Amino acid sequence: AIKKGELTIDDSAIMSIIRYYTREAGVRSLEREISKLCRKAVKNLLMDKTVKHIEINGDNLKDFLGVQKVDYGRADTENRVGQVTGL
Amino acid sequence: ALKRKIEAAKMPKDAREKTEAELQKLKMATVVRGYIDWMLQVPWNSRSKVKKDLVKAQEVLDTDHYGLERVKDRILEYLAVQSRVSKIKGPILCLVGPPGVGKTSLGQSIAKATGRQYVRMALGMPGKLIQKMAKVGVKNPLFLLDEIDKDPASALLEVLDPEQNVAFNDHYLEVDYDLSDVMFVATSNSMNIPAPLLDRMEVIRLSGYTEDEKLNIAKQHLLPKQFERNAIKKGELTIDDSAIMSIIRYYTREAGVRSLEREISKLCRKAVKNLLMDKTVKHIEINGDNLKDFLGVQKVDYGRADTENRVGQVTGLAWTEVGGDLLTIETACVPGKGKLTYTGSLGEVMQESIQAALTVVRARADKLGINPDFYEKRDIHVHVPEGATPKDGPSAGIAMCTALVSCLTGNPVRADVAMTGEITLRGLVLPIGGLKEKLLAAHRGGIKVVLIPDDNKRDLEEIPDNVIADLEIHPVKRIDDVLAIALEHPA
Amino acid sequence: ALKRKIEAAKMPKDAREKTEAELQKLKMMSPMSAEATVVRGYIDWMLQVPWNSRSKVKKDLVKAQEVLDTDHYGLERVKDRILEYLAVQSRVSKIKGPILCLVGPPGVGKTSLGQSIAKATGRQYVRMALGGKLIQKMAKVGVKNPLFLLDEIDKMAPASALLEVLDPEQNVAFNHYLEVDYDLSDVMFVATSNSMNIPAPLLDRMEVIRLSGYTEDEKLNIAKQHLLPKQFERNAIKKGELTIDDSAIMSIIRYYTREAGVRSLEREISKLCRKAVKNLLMDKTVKHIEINGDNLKDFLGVQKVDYGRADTENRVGQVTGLAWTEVGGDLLTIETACVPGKGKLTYTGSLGEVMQESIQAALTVVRARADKLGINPDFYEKRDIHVHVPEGATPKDGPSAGIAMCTALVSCLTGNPVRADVAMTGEITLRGLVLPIGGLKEKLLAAHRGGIKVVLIPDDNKRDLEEIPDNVIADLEIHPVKRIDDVLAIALEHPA
Amino acid sequence: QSRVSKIKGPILCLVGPPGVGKTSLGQSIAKATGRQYVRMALGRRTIGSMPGKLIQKMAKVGVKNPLFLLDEIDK
Numbered sequence A: 001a002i003k004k005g006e007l008t009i010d011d012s013a014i015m016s017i018i019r020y021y022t023r024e025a026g027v028r029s030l031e032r033e034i035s036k037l038c039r040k041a042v043k044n045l046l047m048d049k050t051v052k053h054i055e056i057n058g059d060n061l062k063d064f065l066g067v068q069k070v071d072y073g074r075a076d077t078e079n080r081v082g083q084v085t086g087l
Numbered sequence B: 001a002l003k004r005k006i007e008a009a010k011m012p013k014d015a016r017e018k019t020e021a022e023l024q025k026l027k028m029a030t031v032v033r034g035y036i037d038w039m040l041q042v043p044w045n046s047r048s049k050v051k052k053d054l055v056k057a058q059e060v061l062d063t064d065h066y067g068l069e070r071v072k073d074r075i076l077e078y079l080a081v082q083s084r085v086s087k088i089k090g091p092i093l094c095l096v097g098p099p100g101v102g103k104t105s106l107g108q109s110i111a112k113a114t115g116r117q118y119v120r121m122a123l124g125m126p127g128k129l130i131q132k133m134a135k136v137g138v139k140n141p142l143f144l145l146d147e148i149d150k151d152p153a154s155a156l157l158e159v160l161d162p163e164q165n166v167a168f169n170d171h172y173l174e175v176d177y178d179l180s181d182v183m184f185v186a187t188s189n190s191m192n193i194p195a196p197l198l199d200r201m202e203v204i205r206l207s208g209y210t211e212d213e214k215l216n217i218a219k220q221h222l223l224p225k226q227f228e229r230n231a232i233k234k235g236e237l238t239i240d241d242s243a244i245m246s247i248i249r250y251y252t253r254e255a256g257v258r259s260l261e262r263e264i265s266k267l268c269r270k271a272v273k274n275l276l277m278d279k280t281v282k283h284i285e286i287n288g289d290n291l292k293d294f295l296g297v298q299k300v301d302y303g304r305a306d307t308e309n310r311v312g313q314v315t316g317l318a319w320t321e322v323g324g325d326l327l328t329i330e331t332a333c334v335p336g337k338g339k340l341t342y343t344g345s346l347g348e349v350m351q352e353s354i355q356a357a358l359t360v361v362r363a364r365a366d367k368l369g370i371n372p373d374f375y376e377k378r379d380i381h382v383h384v385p386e387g388a389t390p391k392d393g394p395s396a397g398i399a400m401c402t403a404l405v406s407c408l409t410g411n412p413v414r415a416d417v418a419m420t421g422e423i424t425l426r427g428l429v430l431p432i433g434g435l436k437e438k439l440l441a442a443h444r445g446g447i448k449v450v451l452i453p454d455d456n457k458r459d460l461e462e463i464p465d466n467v468i469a470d471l472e473i474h475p476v477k478r479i480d481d482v483l484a485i486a487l488e489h490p491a
Numbered sequence C: 001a002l003k004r005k006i007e008a009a010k011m012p013k014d015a016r017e018k019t020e021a022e023l024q025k026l027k028m029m030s031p032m033s034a035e036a037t038v039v040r041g042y043i044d045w046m047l048q049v050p051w052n053s054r055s056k057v058k059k060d061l062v063k064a065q066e067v068l069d070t071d072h073y074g075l076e077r078v079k080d081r082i083l084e085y086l087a088v089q090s091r092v093s094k095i096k097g098p099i100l101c102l103v104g105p106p107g108v109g110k111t112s113l114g115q116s117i118a119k120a121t122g123r124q125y126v127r128m129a130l131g132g133k134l135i136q137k138m139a140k141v142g143v144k145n146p147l148f149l150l151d152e153i154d155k156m157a158p159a160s161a162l163l164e165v166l167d168p169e170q171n172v173a174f175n176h177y178l179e180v181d182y183d184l185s186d187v188m189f190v191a192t193s194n195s196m197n198i199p200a201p202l203l204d205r206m207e208v209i210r211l212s213g214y215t216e217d218e219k220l221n222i223a224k225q226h227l228l229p230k231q232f233e234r235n236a237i238k239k240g241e242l243t244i245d246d247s248a249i250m251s252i253i254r255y256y257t258r259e260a261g262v263r264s265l266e267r268e269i270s271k272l273c274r275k276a277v278k279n280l281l282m283d284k285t286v287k288h289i290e291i292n293g294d295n296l297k298d299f300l301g302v303q304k305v306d307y308g309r310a311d312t313e314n315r316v317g318q319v320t321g322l323a324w325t326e327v328g329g330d331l332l333t334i335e336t337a338c339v340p341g342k343g344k345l346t347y348t349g350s351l352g353e354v355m356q357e358s359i360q361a362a363l364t365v366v367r368a369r370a371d372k373l374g375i376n377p378d379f380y381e382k383r384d385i386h387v388h389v390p391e392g393a394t395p396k397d398g399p400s401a402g403i404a405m406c407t408a409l410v411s412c413l414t415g416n417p418v419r420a421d422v423a424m425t426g427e428i429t430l431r432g433l434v435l436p437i438g439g440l441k442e443k444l445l446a447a448h449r450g451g452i453k454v455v456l457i458p459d460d461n462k463r464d465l466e467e468i469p470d471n472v473i474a475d476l477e478i479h480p481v482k483r484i485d486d487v488l489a490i491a492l493e494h495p496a
Numbered sequence D: 001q002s003r004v005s006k007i008k009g010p011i012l013c014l015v016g017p018p019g020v021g022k023t024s025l026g027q028s029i030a031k032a033t034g035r036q037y038v039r040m041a042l043g044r045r046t047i048g049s050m051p052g053k054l055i056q057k058m059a060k061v062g063v064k065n066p067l068f069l070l071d072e073i074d075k
């Protein structure tokens, strides 16, 4: 029930959802995240009559979805002796 | 009489020709009369209207359940989109938690949050569901499906999907009923639901409570409704907060509040018996000293103020889904032929966890002070109690590792500590799931120092911060750093 | 004709218009037909049903106290729990909550206690055994609010549809062959059984109140104050005769009966009474018969079971474990044997897999302590092991008497005899610690009733140990242990 | 049974292998107290229906206080 004006999601917000909140080859978890994100925007509309154009960037999302569930790739300690990531 | 009400206030066409069809069967017999009256008493109109003041629903959820803020926010999201669109044709609310949390009452506080009538249906002659519809008599009820962990079994998915709810048949009512515009709330004790149902349900996790939160719940929402069903009236009976702290800490240990209800109910019973059998006293006051006069000595305890010299016995944390739970993993090292032996009801996942742990120990024979021949001359028995789940099996792997280092070197594990995690061959410590449910258990049993993997550090910014306020938490990443904390001697 | 009775009986409007509904059909059918008489007796079911006339309850709990303690002797931890319910029953007129459940071994007095509560409040009494009926008993009492007992719910498993007779969400209306709903509220229930194997829907609405056994002093006062009078008046023995002294009753309890209740004591006292009466009519010489503790063997028979312990402690293998069984508390002789072989275990005697895990636990206890006991260190593959547990233990009780297996194995290997006045119990870990166990009161009553004089319990049951009220503790030498080395230092009759 | 006018308690039961005198003790007790012997082995209105079996035997002896046996409950 969101009409065409009041919620706007950036590119970088979707890149944060894909890179930080899902691990599969498909788009099912992207649907669960965008579903839950949309109804959290609905709650942040009907509980406050001031704001209407709710904006989300790649910074103001961790109050919606919490912390990053899964991690991204390799910028951490590269010692990891005798381990090797295989495919 | 019969004929003057078969129109039944714009009852739809199909059951009008069916109702008049057995009415002209009546024209040419008691079971016919009842068979008419079933189709007349089920509702066909009168949608009891919703209350779209969602701030009022905010105010009416906080009057019946104290502190389920994440669960309340999720429910109010579902009621926001449930308010704007008249019928959400998506997945159903799924309330999952340990027994004794406000499931089977949260659904009661939803029905007086929208306005629709509460109906409960336990899952442990017309159809059962239309029997309940005839019990309530409204087009748009709230029909709680409880205990989905426990008429054919899986045939209720036609009550949930869109394609079978625009018209629902029956074996012994012959017509089609629309089970659309019927909000459902589904509760369960656990997660292992039969497989088609697990997709149509969005899971809402009601976790356990803490000591302060149980104290506030017992001080606001338990003592009044227990008094008013026993009619103790305002000054006849007071209970200090430290007394409820002794009921919570000592005489029960459970993630719900059901046992607290049983002890408080018993307490009110014996107080009434003191008030009628005696006539001098009229005000009974109960503190932490008068309390064991009214009940037993204890049932369980906590504290870990006992001895700590338990070689080879650490206190793992177990994520059973029926509450988070403590665990006493024990290992021994006997003279023998090196044949490893595992027991404790679990299968082969613990096997690869154990053999991982034993390679971790055998790589460190020098700087731990072990004769390096132990893998072939000394048999090893490794035990873990039965409380776990199939997933999160290789939790408490470093429980087994510290157990083996303790029993080999003869170094006592300090008894206040409690560990968790999953171990690999290099001694690295993998993440584990369900960290809140385990840490509430480690809070409730009186554990001071908990070890978690380093890669679950971000999940500490989800815990209600009274829990972290009492636990000296050390995250680790290497097993060599577990062995400076969990033992009590340098190694 | 017939309507002039039901018009004044005051049934409510639903059953009134059903009664008039088939009634005017009855007055307009042939008054001597067969189906007409079926309707006559059908209405005669409905003349029976008491739709009014509550019997009065009594609120003063002082005479409730003085009406309970005048009939049953010493159930002091139960009568508080029953006067909770009668206290809230006194203030609140209609409790809709849970229902009193009475669980203990048979012979304790539960059927008499539910009979006594009816005398306590004022309401009537109808017992309903379990192996339409309910409207037949409600019609049988002829009153609205009886004390409708439901005995042996455990021996019940219409299949189990009585759970709508219990919950208040269903008790506003219960119909089955009468098809008029009855208001079964304000019909107080008490349910009894013999174990907590109650079906899982029924257990929701039932307050379990435990009735454990009686001890010898307590049975002695029961027979001296409440059994010899009712037996002397159900056989009409005159007053100036049949002086049964105390030591005779002590020999009946100690030597001629073994139960946690007093059922068999009634059989022995009744047989004693009628043998005395037969010796009063087959002779006119004696009139005053006295039966001391000596002449029972000339009067009642031979000492059927044994009590003392001069019983040859040189039993190498068997110990005496205690067992909180389904029917309460019981002695239990756990036996082990060690035969030459390959190293394989052998389970015997209702050993579920938990007891298998505790058997291998005790096996690792022994193998950890091989050399400081003198055992041949390679016994685990030269010599097979057979361990025997006689049944009785509930699977929740389970690994109770775990350390009985460890002392049994140490005794069977080293050939050191277990002294046979030691009633061990406990739950063993792997490494040699002894965990708590529940139901310590049944195990101590069975450990006292068989005359065992030394009991080993775990250390972390110094908590329930004070709550055994009677002088059970005073003559039993109960002393806890915590490690397996305190067990092996005591329960063997040699040092090790 | 001699001193008490009417025992309301339990019932004499005679259990033995087939062949000992468990039937003849009905005769002997019957001519021991004085009452009458009636044996009833084991194994409504309509057409014309007889009464109940037990009251058929009570009509058969025609006395209020018989020694009404009940043979072979096991069968």
Ligand SMILES: Nc1ncnc2c1ncn2[C@@H]1O[C@H](COP(=O)(O)OP(=O)(O)O)[C@@H](O)[C@H]1O
Residues within 6 Å of the ligand: B064, B065, B066, B067, B068, B098, B099, B100, B101, B102, B103, B104, B105, B106, B217, B221, B256, B257, B258, B261
């Ligand atoms: N957050 C809460 N606030 C107030 N009461 C609660 C809360 N959670 C549970 N309860 C209490 O739990 C009791 C009923 O238990 P229930 O919620 O039915 O658990 P279960 O479904 O496991 O039986 C009620 O008295 C209810 O008040």
Ligand SMILES: Nc1ncnc2c1ncn2[C@@H]1O[C@H](COP(=O)(O)OP(=O)(O)O)[C@@H](O)[C@H]1O
Residues within 6 Å of the ligand: C071, C072, C073, C074, C075, C105, C106, C107, C108, C109, C110, C111, C112, C113, C222, C226, C261, C262, C263, C266
């Ligand atoms: N404390 C007591 N005082 C008097 N009589 C008792 C007491 N305890 C038991 N009895 C006797 O025990 C018998 C009741 O047996 P009970 O345990 O009710 O059998 P069941 O459980 O099979 O119904 C009655 O004869 C009663 O007189």
Ligand SMILES: Nc1ncnc2c1ncn2[C@@H]1O[C@H](COP(=O)(O)OP(=O)(O)O)[C@@H](O)[C@H]1O
Residues within 6 Å of the ligand: D018, D019, D020, D021, D022, D023, D024
């Ligand atoms: N002690 C006895 N003295 C004389 N006759 C006996 C004695 N015991 C058994 N009998 C004879 O055995 C028969 C017993 O019949 P019985 O076995 O009682 O029949 P049932 O098949 O009904 O048991 C009688 O005919 C009786 O005369």
